[PDB]
Amino acid sequence: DNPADILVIAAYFLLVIGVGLWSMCRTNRGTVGGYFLAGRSMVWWPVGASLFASNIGSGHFVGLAGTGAASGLAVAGFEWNALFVVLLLGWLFAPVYLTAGVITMPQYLRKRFGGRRIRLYLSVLSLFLYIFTKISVDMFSGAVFIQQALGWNIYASVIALLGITMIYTVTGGLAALMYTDTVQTFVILGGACILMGYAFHEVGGYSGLFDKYLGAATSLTVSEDPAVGNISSFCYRPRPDSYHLLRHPVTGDLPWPALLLGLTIVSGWYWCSDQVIVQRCLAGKSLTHIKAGCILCGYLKLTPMFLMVMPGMISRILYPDEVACVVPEVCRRVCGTEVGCSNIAYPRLVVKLMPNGLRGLMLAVMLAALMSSLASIFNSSSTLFTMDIYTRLRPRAGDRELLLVGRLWVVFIVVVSVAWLPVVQAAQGGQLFDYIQAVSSYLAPPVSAVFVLALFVPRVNEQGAFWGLIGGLLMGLARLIPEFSFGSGSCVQPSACPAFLCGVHYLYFAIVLFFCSGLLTLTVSLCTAPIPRKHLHRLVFSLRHSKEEREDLDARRLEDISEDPSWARVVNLNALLMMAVAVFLWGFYA
C-alpha cells in the first residue's frame, strides 16, 4: 500500500521490459540457433550473471535462511561446493561440448555412444527432475514468501507469477533471458546486501551474531498434547557445532565427507551435465568468455553464506519464540505448520526490519530470483523437448515449426506446474528442502557417473552407458520408495523409518550410488566390444584437439577452441586466485 513500494516494484518491471526490448531489437529469434543458443554470441558478464541468476531462486532465500536458523552455517556447503565445480564446467566439460557442436546434453550422449535409447532416456529423466526438484522449490518458496510478507492468496499469486514468467520466457529466448539476468543479478545482490545490513545492525554486528546465536532457544518447550509432554533439550537448544562447516562424520547433520564428496558428485550433475546451466555455456562467444563467466559466477556463489545463511541465523536470535518454536500448538499458531517454523526466518526479517521504501525492493528481490530461475527452467526444458523428443516424432521438421513447438512446450510446462502446485503445498515446513536434496542425491549420481566416463574414459561404450543409467535408477529408486513410504516427521516426532535406510545420510548414498553406477558401466563396457577412435574425435576430453574426420555414430569455426595465450593466461590465473579465496573461506569456518 506504500507509494514507495509500488514505485520501486514498477521501476524493476521497467528495467526488465527495457532490457528485454533492447535484446529482441538486437538478436535474431527466427532461427533455432538464435532462439535456443543466443546465436552463440554471449560474453563473459552475461554468461556469469546468467549462471548465477539461473541458479539462485526464492528457494535459496527461504531454504538457506530457514536451515541457517535451524542448524547453523553448514548449508553454505551447498553454495561453496559450486566454486570448485564451476571450474570443472569451464576447464573440463565445456571445451568438449563446444567441440562436439551439441545444442542439448542428451545429444552429446547420442554423438558419444550412438544408440537411439540413451538420448530419449536422458530427456525424460531430465524433464521429470525439472518438475520435481527445480519448479517445485520455486513454487513452494514463492508461496512461503507471499503467505508471510504479503498475505495474498497463495494459489492466485503463484498463477499470476507463473503466467508473467511464461510471457517473459516465450517472448525472446535465451538471449533476452541472459541479458536480463544481468539486471536480475544486480537487483538480487543489491537488495540482499541492504537486508544483510539491517539484520547485522539489529543483532549488533558480526560479533553480535557469534555471541548470541547459541543462546537463541525458545521459552515454550512444554506441550498441551499427551504422549508429547516436555520437548527434549536436544531439539529446542541450538546445535553446539552450529558455527562449524565441517561437522562430525557419523553424527553430524551434514557430515563433512558427505558435504565434500557427495555434494561434489551431485553438484557435478547440476553444473556440468545439466541442460539448465550448460545452455548458458553453449551460448558463449568463445571458450575464454565461458571460463571468464565461470569465475564471475564462482566469486558470486560465496555471497549466499553472507546474504542468506547468516541473516537466517540473525532471524533466530531476534524472533526465537517464532523462528525456533518446537511445540506443535505454537507452530500451528505461528506458521500453520505443526512440524516447525524455520521457513518464516527470511520472510520475517523482511516484514519486521525494512522501512516504508525498501520492503518493495525486497519484493523485487524475491520476484527477480523466482522469475530468473523459472524462465531458465522453462527455456531449457523447451530446448530439451523440442530438439530431442519432437525431432524423434518429426525428423524433417525445420527451423520454423521447431520454434512454434518450443513456445507451445513453455505453455504446457506452465500448466503442468499449476496442476503440481497443490502436491508441493502438501509438503509441510522445511522437510521440502530435505526432500529435494534427497531426490537429487538418488537420481543424479548415475548421470554424473556416465558423463565423467563419457568424457574421460573412451573405452566406455553404449551398452555400458545405458545399463549404467538404468542400474542406477534401480538402486536409487530403492532408497526413494522406501523413504517416501515412512515420511519424515520431525525431531519432536521421529518417523518409524528403519535406520539402515534413513541413518545413512542421503549425501553418503550419493557417493555409494555414483561408484556403483560407475562400476556397472565399466563392467558392462569391458565385457562388450568397444567404439573405435574414428567414431570419437572432438567428443572425448583426450580428442578435443583432433582435426581428423570423425565418423558419426549418428561450421568449423565452432569446432575451434584455441584461445589467445594472453587471455588464457589471465583466466587461468584468476581461477587459481578464486580457488585460493574459496579454500581460505572453507578454512575460516571449518
Binding site: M579, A580, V583, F584, W586, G587, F588, A590
Partner: peptide
C-alpha cells in the same frame, strides 16, 4: 584461531597445485 585455519587450508592448496604442475610436467610430456 580461524585465520590460521584459513591460511593452513590455502598452504595445503598451493602444495596440491604445485603437485599438479609436477605430475603433468613429468607425466604428460
Amino acid at each position: 584461531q580461524p585465520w590460521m585455519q584459513g591460511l593452513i587450508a590455502v598452504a595445503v592448496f598451493l602444495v596440491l597445485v604445485a603437485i599438479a604442475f609436477a605430475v603433468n610436467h613429468f607425466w604428460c610430456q
